[PDB]
Amino acid sequence: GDEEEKHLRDMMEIVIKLFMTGDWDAFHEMADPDVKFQVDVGDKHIHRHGREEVVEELIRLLEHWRVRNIRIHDIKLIGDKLVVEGRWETSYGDKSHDEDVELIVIVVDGKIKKVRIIIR
Amino acid sequence: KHLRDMMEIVIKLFMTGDWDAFHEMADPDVKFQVDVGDKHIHRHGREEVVEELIRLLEHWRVRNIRIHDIKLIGDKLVVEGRWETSYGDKSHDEDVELIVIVVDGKIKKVRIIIR
Questions:
Q1: Is B15–A14 a contact, with Cβ atoms under 8 angstroms apart?
Q2: How far is CA A101 from CA A31, A51, A70, A87, A114, in A?
Q3: Cα gap A46→A40, rounded to integer Å
Q4: Which of A65, A107, B18, B25 is the most buried (most CB within 10 A)?
Q5: Are strands A111-119 and A100-108 parallel, antiparallel or unpaired?
C-alpha cells in the first residue's frame, strides 16, 4: 500500500523534471514546504530552506546556465533518493555552457524534500 | 528489492536525450509494439526499434504524465498511467499502459497500449 504509492510518486517526479520538457516551473507544486536545497559550485556552497527560498534560488541557477533540461548519463533509484549524473541542455548556440552536473533528489510523502546540485 | 529498482531504472532510459542508453540495453531482437485503437505499430530488431522511437517519441508532445499503477511480475514490468498529448493547440488526456519485459538483463519487449 504505502510502498507502491511512494514508488508511483517517485516516477512522476522523474518524468516532470528530467523528461516532460524542462517543466522546472512545476518545481513549486512538487516541492515540500520545508524543502532543502544545497548547491555546490566549485568552492562556493549555497544552502537554502523553505519552498520560496529554494524556488527563487533554483530559478537563478537555471537562468545562469540557460537550462532547458538535463542530458542524462546515468540514474540510480535508491529507495526515496534519485541520483542523476548528466550534462546541461542549454539554449546556447553551442556547447559552451554544458557543464557536468550531479543531482540528488529526496522524495518524502510524494513531495521533493531535498535537492542537491553539484557543478564542476 | 534490486530487481524492482533495476527494472525501474531501465524504464527511465525513455528520458536520456538520446537513444544511446536504450541501444546498449535492448536485446538485438527486441520487439516494440504501439497499439492506439486501430493503428498497431510492430517493430522487431534493435535497429528497427530505435528508428521507430526517433520518429514516434520526438514529435509526440507529452505533458502531465501521471502514474496510476506499477506492478513487477518477474521479468515483466507493467505501468498504467495517464498523460496529456497535444497536436498544436488541441489537446486531450488518455490512458496509457507501458509493458516492458527484460530477459537476462536485456530489453526483449516494449508495448505501449493507449485506450
A1: yes
A2: 20, 22, 9, 6, 16
A3: 7
A4: A107
A5: antiparallel
Q: How was this structure determined?
A: X-ray
Give me A104's grid cell: 540528488
Cell of B63: 505533458
> What distance in Å separates the CA atoms of residue A16 and residue A22, rounded to the nearest whole number?
7
Buried b (16+ CB within 10 A) or exposed e, A30-41: bbbeebbbbbee
d(C-alpha A24, C-alpha A62), whole Å: 9
From B67's Cα to the closest Cα of chain A, the distance in A is 6
Please report residues of A whose CB lies closer than 8 A to that of B16. 71-73
As a whole number of angstroms, the distance between CA B62 and CA B58 comes to: 10
Q: Which of A8, A14, A77 sits opposite B70 (nearest CB)?
A: A8
Closest CA to A117 of A37, A11, A54: A37
